[PDB]
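Ligand-bound model needed. FY4.
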Amino acid sequence: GFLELERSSGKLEWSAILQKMASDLGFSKILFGLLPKDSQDYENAFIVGNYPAAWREHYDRAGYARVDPTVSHCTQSVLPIFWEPSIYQTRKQHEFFEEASAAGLVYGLTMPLHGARGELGALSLSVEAENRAEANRFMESVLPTLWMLKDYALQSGAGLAFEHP
Amino acid sequence: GFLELERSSGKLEWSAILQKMASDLGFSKILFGLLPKDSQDYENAFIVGNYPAAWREHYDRAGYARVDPTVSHCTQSVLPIFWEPSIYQTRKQHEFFEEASAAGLVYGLTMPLHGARGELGALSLSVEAENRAEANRFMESVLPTLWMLKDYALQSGAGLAFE
Ligand SMILES: O=C(Oc1c(Br)cc(Br)cc1CNC(=O)c1ccccc1[N+](=O)[O-])c1ccc(Cl)cc1
Ligand SMILES: O=C(Oc1c(Br)cc(Br)cc1CNC(=O)c1ccccc1[N+](=O)[O-])c1ccc(Cl)cc1
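Prediction:
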């Protein structure tokens, strides 16, 4: 089932496969981001997914990589961080959550990625729900499968991003 | 349930909880091994579990970390490597298999560990089974739980081992 990711050729097909797998687990929007070992900026990043273009552009332009609490979490942990104003603290973090919400990305989680060759990144996934309690139930229900998925995505994605011609 | 590891008082309780979780999942033998970022040897290694003393000693004395096919795998991948005939390619690797088997460790898997601060390790677990078919069925039934377990063990073990 996860073998399809390795089987695919090209970032187009790979991203579509990952998006479908995530959708089948109940997540309508995902972002897979991966950096080479000891990256000092985002110039060499591999970023694929179906987050809206407007949000992608805004997050970049507003410098949210330095605000987003899930980013610093990824540098410190292999465990997922669930999206909660709570991981929000500062005024800019308040701004970030408000704007993410406005973009339609309210509930979700970010799974850190730490590759065998020092690759650093995340698979972030948003879930549409009536409320946070329901979102949490949807997410808990698929957490073991998502845990496998994130490592399969890391192993195959690192190859696609940085290695395969 | 997994957070019991990080909520443990220290090394002794952490090891007992880890071994108990594994046992409850159906694995009577486990080994958690973790090295700090960019290790030259095993002088600062954090190694915990209930592998038999005799086998621990033999592996060290034989220098099996240079032969064990799961070790090289861990340096290349985040995915588990199951203990199957195909992973033992050379006679030296076959001899390793036979010695591990003679020690009681025949069926199992090794989960690579790659920490946020460059920690490198493995969580290995062995199941006592009658044959390969029974071993495989059992491991497939628990694999998703084990997959979460290894990351919780890593995050808590790294915090315990190097801080
Ligand atoms: O992919 C990465 O960051 C990015 C990048 Br780039 C662009 C966007 Br747009 C979003 C993210 C990550 N945040 C989220 O997904 C998120 C989190 C909480 C609430 C809402 C959202 N949300 O809706 O965006 C990344 C991962 C690891 C590292 Cl170490 C560095 C960067
Ligand atoms: O913990 C580590 O290795 C060790 C160390 Br030390 C001591 C012993 Br004893 C065993 C291992 C790992 N092999 C196994 O468990 C195994 C695998 C297949 C078949 C049989 C067995 N088996 O029965 O031992 C380690 C992990 C990552 C790195 Cl990068 C380096 C070392």
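Chain A has one domain: 1-165.
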